[PDB]
Write a protein that binds this DNA or RNA. Structure first.
Ligand SMILES: Nc1nc2c(ncn2[C@@H]2O[C@H](COP(=O)(O)OP(=O)(O)OP(=O)(O)O)[C@@H](O)[C@H]2O)c(=O)[nH]1
Ligand SMILES: *C(=O)[C@H](CCSC)NC=O
Ligand SMILES: [K+]
Ligand SMILES: [K+]
Ligand SMILES: [K+]
Ligand SMILES: [K+]
Ligand SMILES: [K+]
Ligand SMILES: [K+]
Ligand SMILES: [K+]
Ligand SMILES: [K+]
Ligand SMILES: [K+]
Ligand SMILES: [K+]
Ligand SMILES: [K+]
Ligand SMILES: [K+]
Ligand SMILES: [K+]
Ligand SMILES: [K+]
Ligand SMILES: [Mg+2]
Ligand SMILES: [Mg+2]
Ligand SMILES: [Mg+2]
Ligand SMILES: [Mg+2]
Ligand SMILES: [Mg+2]
Ligand SMILES: [Mg+2]
Ligand SMILES: [Mg+2]
Ligand SMILES: [Mg+2]
Ligand SMILES: [Mg+2]
Ligand SMILES: [Mg+2]
Ligand SMILES: [Mg+2]
Ligand SMILES: [Mg+2]
Ligand SMILES: [Mg+2]
Ligand SMILES: [Mg+2]
Ligand SMILES: [Mg+2]
Ligand SMILES: [Mg+2]
Ligand SMILES: [Mg+2]
Ligand SMILES: [Mg+2]
Ligand SMILES: [Mg+2]
Ligand SMILES: [Mg+2]
Ligand SMILES: [Mg+2]
Ligand SMILES: [Mg+2]
Ligand SMILES: [Mg+2]
Ligand SMILES: [Mg+2]
Ligand SMILES: [Mg+2]
Ligand SMILES: [Mg+2]
Ligand SMILES: [Mg+2]
Ligand SMILES: [Mg+2]
Ligand SMILES: [Mg+2]
Ligand SMILES: [Mg+2]
Ligand SMILES: [Mg+2]
Ligand SMILES: [Mg+2]
Ligand SMILES: [Mg+2]
Ligand SMILES: [Mg+2]
Ligand SMILES: [Mg+2]
Ligand SMILES: [Mg+2]
Ligand SMILES: [Mg+2]
Ligand SMILES: [Mg+2]
Ligand SMILES: [Mg+2]
Ligand SMILES: [Mg+2]
Ligand SMILES: [Mg+2]
Ligand SMILES: [Mg+2]
Ligand SMILES: [Mg+2]
Lengths: 571, 69
RNA sequence: AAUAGGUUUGGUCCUAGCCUUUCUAUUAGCUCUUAGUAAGAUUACACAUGCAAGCAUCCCCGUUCCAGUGAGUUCACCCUCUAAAUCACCACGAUCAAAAGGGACAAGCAUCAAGCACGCAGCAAUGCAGCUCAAAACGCUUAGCCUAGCCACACCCCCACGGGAAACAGCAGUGAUUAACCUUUAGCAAUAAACGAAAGUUUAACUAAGCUAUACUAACCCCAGGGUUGGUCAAUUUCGUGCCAGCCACCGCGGUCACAC
RNA sequence: CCCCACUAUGCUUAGCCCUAAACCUCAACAGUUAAAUCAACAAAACUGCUCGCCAGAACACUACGAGCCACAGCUUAAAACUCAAAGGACCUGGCGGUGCUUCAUAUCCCUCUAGAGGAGCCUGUUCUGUAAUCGAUAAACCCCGAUCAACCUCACCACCUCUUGCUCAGCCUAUAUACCGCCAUCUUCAGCAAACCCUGAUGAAGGCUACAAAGUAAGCGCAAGUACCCACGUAAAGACGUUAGGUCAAGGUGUAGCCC
RNA sequence: AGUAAACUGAGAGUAGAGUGCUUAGUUGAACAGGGCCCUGAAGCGCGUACACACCGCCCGUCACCCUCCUCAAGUAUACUUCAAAGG
RNA sequence: CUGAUGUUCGCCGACCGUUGACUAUUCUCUA
């Protein structure tokens, strides 16, 4: 039994009824773009962040520990509404206790409102409906309630459990009712978590800070986190160095259902990864070493099937060439092959081959790991590989670095920064190396620019516009310079023919030829443009073309047209 | 390989952290390296491959250990 | 290079390079039980936060030290003369030690062979035309050194009025970067330093701890893994594969009976 | 390369150029023959003293720099990449359009006799052809395995049938490059080899002089004998090795494969 | 040399089958002397970069491929030096 | 006189069998 011992750290078994102590509810504000999710959050946070955003779009998931006037504390996870951030919405629904669905009355149910509802069903979390924008004209709360019925959201008026509170976050009207409804449902849920023992949690965001290092925002689920706690999260472990809140003030303890930024990570955890506390740092490294090994075995088994395929093909080509002759002495086989080796002249292809023009290599750098995963999921929705190929050289979190410039210069790639900066040293180095750093701040802007670079790679789409049409009548053989020149006598019927514009020969609907006239000569005089009804003798540059009495010729003008990428990202 | 050996020895070209592109031998039976991947290279020349002076380290970065049998 | 060994050839002798066996350090793979001790960023790249210089009847004194780093680089040693400082005060001196003067003082390249004012006399005026150099001048490149320790540097412009600009090469920590990666511990109890007449105060110096098989020492009822096994060179059975897949420090092995995969 | 013609050039004068296997590849001066003479070869071995030069091969009588009446030049002269050798002198053998000498005795040439190559047929082979064997295949295959195929022989081809089968099964399946057996070939040869001894400074190696100088040699072959009509001739014999020569299809058999 | 040449018989093996093979006999020659020129052998040398050995080895031109280096038009970038001075 | 050409190869650790089990050479039968 020489198999690695299991040293993983697992979630503690469900807390005993005695241990369970009441805890605060976790709430997520889910909905569609520009339906008021942030504006509603601001009224309860008592702070305005909507105006202080790039484009007024929420592109991050933030957990804020709001304290209600009654004295209760609630954690609000403000999720993004854009289509790109589907993963962020699913992660929010997996750590939440209640989902506050913000369905605007003016617009109603939308594509991302249904997606928000689906995530709640998978997580099995009670939903509280908030009909925002009730003030504006066409704001029908009843229509929203009826439409939600199709998607399995039944309001109380129609006999359902979901609680619908009409609200207007802009004017702060009826917001108290939604706060009361949220508190009521949380008490019905009877949320309780043991506040003692090894800490459990989930990562909400993970990013690199230049001064504080690797930082992960997380929500505690069991136990209490303190300075010096050893934490494992996937393939990364930490010893808690600093615990801070949304405002940066250090917190000494993080009780269950509390948002807490954690520093001290020796590697950057993935967003959504569970956090567990271990006895010591050597134990943490033991747990991480066993998770890395398991990942290497899973990759190894995958690699084995690919290698076995490459090795089976080669062995067939080897058995075939060997069995070409019998099982004779190898001296004879090389001599018999020498007979067919004297007939063999192969050419070795260059070991280093040229990357084709229609190949876009991109380096993706982002401020937070969740932002990078969003861009990487968008790059996985590329379906136009035939026209142009999109290669991902490297992806990471943090500002643009020399390695990103070196990797871009190595593969002639383009660096795309998302809410990240590039210093003068990095920007100057890119100029010398020819790399293009493309810092953005909005995800729809970074995708539009990604599509513009793909379009440039695409081949120029020539546009063929018919210029004229002329039917041949008589074929002449002219002797000029001791050379017999076949001349096609043609009558222009519709349109005109121009010497520059390209031509093509047409036989009873078939396309015989494609090219330009060698000589255009009319009445022994060269005329560049023959009008409709003008007789013109036509000689081609291709002597193999046979001219009949009834052939047709269609002239055309070719104009290259900028080709746009067929790939659409869904927004 | 150079005479008298005959074989198809799996090699790769890699740009080093110093900025010098070099040919590196991949030891073991079967590999899955691809473009854009990260590898650690060590010394030790391939005796029958003229000019091959670098060797990829199996089991580091994206190059994994040889799969048994 | 040694007590040497392998390898040029059809074979011998000679010569010769390469490699082997020895001993360290770093890094990678795989693997790892405990205790004590020692040592511990790849980088003169950029640094969040905290702390690292106070003392004291006001003046002064100290923060010019310790600690750090190795960028630059014959300012480090000896002699002569001689400030500042210690011996309360003069010491009519000793001790310690600058500046100045004299001597000595890394490596590679001579395909760097000439340097271009590099000398001397005179009170001065001024006069003479000399001075260094194949016994290596001048020059380029490389590097901290001669380690009870010393030298140099202290973000850059050798300097630092001025300017660029806003400084961890103090401790802890971090980004980038590299194959290279220690805790955002505690205490001034000991020693050392600063200050005070003193009781004392302060000190990320330092002390006692934290982390890490990099090393050394010791130990453990249970608990061993890594590499190798053709020759050099200690040590292979049964199969599979068939000049393929692969191996090799060197010589070499594998083409259907492989002690070499 | 051979033949003819003719120019630069070789000559003189005046300037240049500054190179040679400019090598007697052996530095100048002094001294020794004493020994521990001495890797080998060459032209014996060394001592004192001094200057010059050298440090794996190749890159390289090259690149760059500098100098020069040199301008497709000369002198000075590296590095990167590459290799595990290059190199010097030998031993033995082979080979030489290699020397001298003596020869060939159906025989190398000039000679002698009858043939083959041309015709038809007979027979073998190669190609082509066929559903339709295999082996031999320069000398040393080709009326060859066969002193022999209409069936049979037979191993081939097509179709059909049998499965512990004539056999305590079977296989003309692969491999003559695993072999025995039996042979071809040099051989129309005379040489192979044990055991010793000696020489070369105890290197691979070598070992004869008859007025003799380091060889002695069992055994094997030649020879001698025997067969046929002699003591002649013809047969027979003919070692060790050479060509992984022929033959797994005489038979046997190692290894691998087949077993409805 | 009873050779070559010509002629005749027999045998092996088959049921039969060869212009083949093995074998007995008959008749029965010519040339045999010069030569070392040609191709070889022996003896004694010479040469050798060959050594599964001349059917050996081997040099250069002319591709693909891989590695490194140099020259180089125009241009750009970076670094170095200045005051170790003068009024 | 002319006489061009011909892709590829050397190392393993051997060396004991013996041989004896029969037990009796001294008849004939007898009860
Ligand atoms: N008239 C009106 N405007 C409203 C109301 N609630 C929100 N808005 C506006 O709607 C716009 C979008 O508001 P946000 O808070 O950014 O909405 P969101 O759903 O969080 O947006 P994403 O994060 O991009 O999904 C802003 O201009 C608000 O002022 C409301 O009740 N009435
Ligand atoms: C040639 O000249 C051309 C032939 C026409 S056939 C109908 N006519 C005018 O140029
Ligand atoms: K918005
Ligand atoms: K080989
Ligand atoms: K040696
Ligand atoms: K004081
Ligand atoms: K230094
Ligand atoms: K400085
Ligand atoms: K103290
Ligand atoms: K070995
Ligand atoms: K000479
Ligand atoms: K010879
Ligand atoms: K004939
Ligand atoms: K045989
Ligand atoms: K047989
Ligand atoms: K057999
Ligand atoms: Mg929002
Ligand atoms: Mg190696
Ligand atoms: Mg040699
Ligand atoms: Mg110090
Ligand atoms: Mg340094
Ligand atoms: Mg003084
Ligand atoms: Mg001084
Ligand atoms: Mg030079
Ligand atoms: Mg330095
Ligand atoms: Mg600094
Ligand atoms: Mg300074
Ligand atoms: Mg520090
Ligand atoms: Mg770091
Ligand atoms: Mg280290
Ligand atoms: Mg005092
Ligand atoms: Mg302190
Ligand atoms: Mg310590
Ligand atoms: Mg290790
Ligand atoms: Mg085997
Ligand atoms: Mg093996
Ligand atoms: Mg003349
Ligand atoms: Mg004369
Ligand atoms: Mg001469
Ligand atoms: Mg000379
Ligand atoms: Mg001299
Ligand atoms: Mg020359
Ligand atoms: Mg030259
Ligand atoms: Mg030159
Ligand atoms: Mg004859
Ligand atoms: Mg004929
Ligand atoms: Mg035949
Ligand atoms: Mg055959
Ligand atoms: Mg054969
Ligand atoms: Mg039959
Ligand atoms: Mg038949
Ligand atoms: Mg058969
Ligand atoms: Mg044979
Ligand atoms: Mg006789
Ligand atoms: Mg005979
Ligand atoms: Mg005889
Ligand atoms: Mg053979
Ligand atoms: Mg030849
Ligand atoms: Mg050959």
């Amino acid at each position: 039994d020489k198999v690695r011992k299991n040293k993983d750290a697992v979630r503690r078994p469900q807390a005993d009824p005695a241990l369970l102590t009441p805890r605060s509810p976790v709430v997520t504000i889910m909905g569609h773009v520009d339906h008021g999710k942030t504006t509603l959050l601001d009224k309860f946070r008592k702070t305005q962040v909507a105006a202080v955003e790039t484009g007024g779009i929420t592109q991050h998931i933030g957990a804020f520990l709001v304290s209600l006037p009654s004295g209760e504390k609630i954690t609000f996870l403000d999720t993004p509404g854009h289509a790109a951030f589907s993963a962020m919405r699913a992660r929010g629904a997996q750590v939440t206790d209640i989902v506050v669905l913000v369905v605007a009355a003016d617009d109603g149910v939308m594509k991302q409102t249904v997606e928000s509802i689906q995530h709640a069903k998978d997580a099995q979390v009670p939903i509280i409906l908030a009909v925002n924008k009730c003030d504006k004209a066409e704001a029908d709360p009843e229509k929203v309630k009826k439409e939600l019925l199709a998607y399995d959201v039944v309001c109380e008026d129609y006999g359902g459990d979901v609680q619908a509170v009409p609200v207007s976050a802009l004017t702060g009207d009826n917001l108290m009712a939604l706060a009361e409804a949220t508190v009521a449902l949380a008490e019905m849920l009877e949320l309780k978590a043991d506040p003692n023992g090894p800490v459990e949690g989930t990562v909400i965001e993970s990013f690199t800070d230049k001064g504080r290092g690797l930082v992960t925002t997380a929500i505690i689920q069991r136990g209490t986190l303190r300075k010096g706690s050893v934490l494992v999260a996937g393939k990364c472990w930490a010893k808690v160095r600093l615990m801070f809140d949304e405002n940066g003030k250090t917190i000494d303890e993080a009780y269950p259902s509390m948002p807490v930024g954690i520093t001290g990570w020796r590697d950057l955890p993935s967003a959504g990864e569970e956090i567990l506390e271990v006895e010591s740092e050597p134990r943490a490294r033991e747990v991480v070493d066993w998770r890395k090994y398991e990942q290497e075995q899973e990759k190894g088994q995958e690699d084995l099937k690919i290698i076995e395929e490459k090795r089976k093909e080669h062995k067939e080509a080897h058995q075939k060439a060997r069995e070409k002759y019998g099982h004779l002495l190898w001296k004879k086989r090389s001599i018999l092959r020498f007979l067919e080796r004297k007939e063999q002249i192969p050419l070795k292809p260059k070991e280093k081959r040229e990357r084709d023009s229609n190949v876009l290599s991109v380096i993706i750098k982002g401020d937070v790991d969740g932002s990078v995963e969003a861009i990487l999921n968008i790059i996985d929705t590329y379906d136009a590989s035939h026209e142009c190929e999109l290669e991902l050289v490297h992806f990471g979190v943090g500002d643009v670095s020399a390695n990103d410039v070196n990797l871009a210069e190595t593969f002639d790639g383009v660096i795309y920064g998302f809410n990240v900066n590039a210093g003068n040293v990095i920007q100057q180095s890119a100029a010398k190396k020819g790399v293009k750093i493309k810092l953005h701040k909005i995800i729809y802007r970074l995708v539009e620019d990604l599509q513009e670079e793909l379009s440039s790679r695409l081949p120029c789409a020539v546009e063929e516009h018919p210029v004229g049409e002329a039917s041949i009548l008589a074929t002449f053989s002219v002797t000029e310079g001791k050379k017999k020149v076949p001349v096609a006598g043609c009558r222009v019927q519709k349109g005109q023919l121009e010497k520059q514009k390209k031509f093509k020969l047409t036989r009873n609907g078939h396309v015989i030829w494609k090219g330009s006239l060698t000589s255009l000569k009319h009445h022994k005089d060269d005329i560049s443009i023959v009008k409709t009804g003008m007789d013109c003798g036509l000689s081609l540059d291709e002597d193999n073309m046979e001219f009949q009495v009834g052939d047709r010729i269609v002239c055309y003008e070719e104009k290259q047209i900028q080709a746009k990428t067929s790939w659409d990202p869904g927004f | 390989p150079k005479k008298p050996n005959s074989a198809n020895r799996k090699c790769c070209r890699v740009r080093l952290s110093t900025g010098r592109e070099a040919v590196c031998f991949i030891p073991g039976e079967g590999h899955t390296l691809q473009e854009h991947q990260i590898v650690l290279v060590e010394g030790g020349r391939t005796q029958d491959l003229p000019g091959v002076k670098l060797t990829v380290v199996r089991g580091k970065y994206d190059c994994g250990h040889v799969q048994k049998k």
